[PDB]
Design a protein around this ligand. Structure first.
Ligand SMILES: CN1CCC(c2ccc(-c3ccc4c(c3)C(=O)N([C@H](c3cccc(F)c3)c3nc5ccccc5[nH]3)C4)cc2)CC1
Ligand SMILES: *CCC(=O)Nc1cc(Nc2nccc(-c3cn(C)c4ccccc34)n2)c(OC)cc1N(C)CCN(C)C
Length: 294
């Protein structure tokens, strides 16, 4: 219970709306420690509804779990303010979500970032599986960018039909193997630089298209090796889909040599940060003990 700090309304302020997500609106905010003069940027989620003391017990019970995750690629809940409409606090990611990031640097990211992102998302998901926590809403929008070299998964354990496995659409079954399905769509989002999956198709017909056997198409920058992993994530039998621990190894193998698995125009004119630049980013923005990029 020492991982979730109970906050007062007077020690933080919302200053700008960042967007809208699960159970409420997310703001960029400022934390002002009691008796201090500093202003610390934070992220604040204010629920879209009023709550009662009783429901706040269900909230705090889940909030203690959400604050107990410890992995470089999983976001941790930091605090909560039980003010009628509950307010949650986590670290603010200045680079935004990976979905917006990949759209904004479209066709200009490079293969080595993309593959390492897949490695890091799989590391976080494999961590959640080790904790026996199902995400249930993995998507590019829920992958935050701490630095361009370091992403973290957020908002797990809380309808996105076009990301859900077939057994989740048909029977609301959410397992770690259905998280693998959503991971496949998330990678598809990254390889298409943020395209909307099954765009233009009504949600009510998605289950039919999956039962008929059709899947999202192969991105032009993807070799067949990459598309196959995506397709193996979308097999109808959940236990036939790959494990997150296997996805880590496979995308790490492809990251040890990126240009053979992604075909991008100008890829050599990009490249990952030099160690000099990597140490600069980390001393300013990312002091965590993350492993390393491939
Ligand atoms: C009858 N009634 C039905 C529903 C009700 C209820 C309502 C809310 C939560 C609940 C309880 C706890 C969390 C969330 C949501 C929720 O959305 N969370 C995100 C999360 C999850 C995991 C890791 C992580 F870093 C963050 C998250 N996004 C943020 C954005 C900005 C600031 C803070 C943020 N916090 C944590 C549980 C039950 C109680 C019973
Ligand atoms: C994908 C939408 C998005 O996340 N946009 C931005 C997020 C920023 N930081 C941040 N830090 C912590 C938590 C969140 C967060 C969590 N959830 C569930 C959200 C839902 C909707 C919106 C944000 C959410 N976000 C951020 O830092 C300043 C900026 C952005 N924006 C607006 C775009 C990114 N880029 C232009 C800077």
């Amino acid at each position: 219970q020492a991982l979730l700090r109970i906050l007062k309304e007077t020690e933080f302020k919302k200053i700008k709306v960042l967007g809208s997500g699960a159970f409420g609106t997310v703001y960029k905010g400022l934390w002002i420690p009691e008796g201090e003069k500093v202003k610390i940027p934070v992220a604040i989620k204010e629920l879209r509804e009023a709550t009662s003391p009783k429901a706040n017990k269900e909230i705090l019970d889940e909030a203690y779990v959400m604050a107990s995750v410890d992995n470089p690629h999983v976001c941790r809940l930091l605090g909560i303010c039980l003010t009628s409409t509950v307010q949650l606090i986590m670290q603010l990611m200045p680079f935004g979500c990976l979905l917006d990031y990949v759209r904004e640097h479209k066709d200009n990211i490079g293969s080595q970032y993309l593959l390492n992102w897949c490695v890091q998302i799989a590391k976080g998901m494999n961590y959640l599986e080790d904790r026996r926590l199902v995400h249930r809403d993995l998507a590019a929008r829920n992958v935050l960018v701490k630095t361009p070299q370091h992403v973290k998964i957020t908002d797990f354990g809380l309808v996105p039909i076009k990301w859900m496995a077939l057994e989740s659409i048909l029977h609301r079954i959410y397992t770690h193997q259905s998280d693998v399905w959503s991971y496949g769509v998330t990678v598809w989002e990254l390889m298409t630089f943020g395209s909307k999956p099954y765009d233009g198709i009504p949600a009510s017909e998605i289950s039919s298209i999956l039962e008929k056997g059709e899947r999202l198409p192969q991105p032009p920058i993807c070799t067949i090796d990459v598309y196959m992993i995506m397709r193996k994530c979308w097999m109808i039998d959940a236990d036939s889909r790959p494990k997150f621990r296997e996805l880590i190894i496979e995308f790490s193998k492809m990251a040890r040599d990126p240009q053979r698995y992604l075909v991008i125009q100008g890829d050599e004119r990009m490249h990952l940060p030099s160690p000099t630049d990597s140490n600069f980013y980390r001393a300013l923005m990312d002091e965590e003990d993350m492993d390393d990029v491939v």
